[model samples]
Target: GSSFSGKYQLQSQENFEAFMKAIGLPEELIQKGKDIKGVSEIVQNGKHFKFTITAGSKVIQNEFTVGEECELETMTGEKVKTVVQLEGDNKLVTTFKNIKSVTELNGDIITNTMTLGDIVFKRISKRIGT
Candidate 1:
């Protein structure tokens, strides 16, 4: 089975401001965040899961299970209640507000796709920890 449990170091990004801007993220935060490297820690056990992606001084830790509704905090520090799911034989998936999310895996590289309206921002992050 494919595993989504690993600490991932952000590798590269595309459509950075395009998708974010449509989602209402502040320009200052967007530009500031655009230049910084990021790490995503996803520790999944059983049906329970833990996600980590901190932006600047804000740390939003979302621990939830699949098929459950949770109030997840956005990168820019906003709240949205959504349900997480497992699609494509088990992969990183969720939706926040008007955004549709999914992470497709190919070896150690995980390509996360976030679509806001018609804009889809894709970023590739490589797994770090075994």
Candidate 2:
């Protein structure tokens, strides 16, 4: 089974601002979001996963079950329904509204590729404390 339980810190991002704007974030928020590096603490137990994401002055916590429909909030606080599925043994695929994100854990690095409309961005994070 795939287990993504670990602490990770954001190290690199591509076209982050463009993706943020596509999701309807305000200009000021997008600017601030660009300069922010987020830390994620993930806990996975069986089919349940808890994600605690801390970025700058904001912290968001989400818990969901694999292969089930759940309500999740976007960065701008919009509630949406989504299904999370595990692929192979190291990838999580989530689909909601007009967004689809694929997250894969490879050794000490976690890479997330998110797509919305025609805008796509990749965020790469490294495991903290090895």
Candidate 3:
């Protein structure tokens, strides 16, 4: 969990188009978003985490502790209160807007996968700085 506490840059994304559409992203925005390699900064303390996720000009500041229901902004910047679960040693599971998302840290690389219906979108990020 401690290893997940750092800054990460998005490396790649899979099936982003269909997934974004399933999540109800605007058709025009999805085209622009496909090229945006965002960054995520995670500040982890015990079970609490503060996330600063930014791509292009849009940014989301979300904070929550594991197993607690709290308000968080979705990728679309909409607000929702949800509970996050830490599964195994690294995977964080959460749901919003008919989407179930899981973020798992594999050492310095973070893999985030989102599912909506049959759409599966996956993104990978690697740690930056020391």
Candidate 4:
């Protein structure tokens, strides 16, 4: 089974802002900037923090922060509305395959991993009205 694998260097919101500045974000956004909605952070053992943001679809590796707020961003660069959180850790690797589809509830679909046997049983039950 194909699983996800990657490496990531933890960063703080402040450091990410610096990175933005390095990339030529507006001077106002850097020097005297206000916070953007997508910018995220996680508290360390004490006052230290780590920045959390998605690496985007173009990147082969998925980088993220644990115990931090995240969002599913649009490929077209639109405002992100789907917020998700990942379990905390460093350089996480997994054999669990990604979900291809999910059963929706009240118009909301959640990502989940289930065994093939369960999926077939559910389909049979639904068709049988049981």
Checking candidate 4 for backbone clashes, the offending pairs are 11-51
Candidate 4 overall lDDT versus native:
0.27
Clashes (backbone N, CA, C under 3 Å), per candidate, total 0, 0, 0, 1
TM-score ranking, high to low: 2, 3, 1, 4
- Each model's C-alpha lDDT? 0.80, 0.87, 0.87, 0.27
Q: Best lDDT goes to which candidate?
A: 3
**How would you order the candidates by lDDT, starting with the best?**
3, 2, 1, 4
Say which candidate scores most in TM-score. 2
Candidate 4 C-alpha lDDT tens digits along 1-130: 1011211222213343544443345666454432432222222332222323333222221223333333333222333332233233222212112212222111111112222322311111011111
TM-score for candidate 4: 0.20
TM-score, candidate 2, is 0.94
Off by over 4 Å in 2: none
What are the per-residue Cα lDDT tens digits for candidate 2 across 1-130? Answer: 3379999999999989998888887888888889688898888997898888888887888888998887887788787988899998899899876899999999989999999878888999999973
Summed over model 3, clashes come to 0
Clash pairs detected, candidate 1: none
> Which is superior by TM-score, 1 or 3?
3
Whole-structure CA lDDT of model 3: 0.87
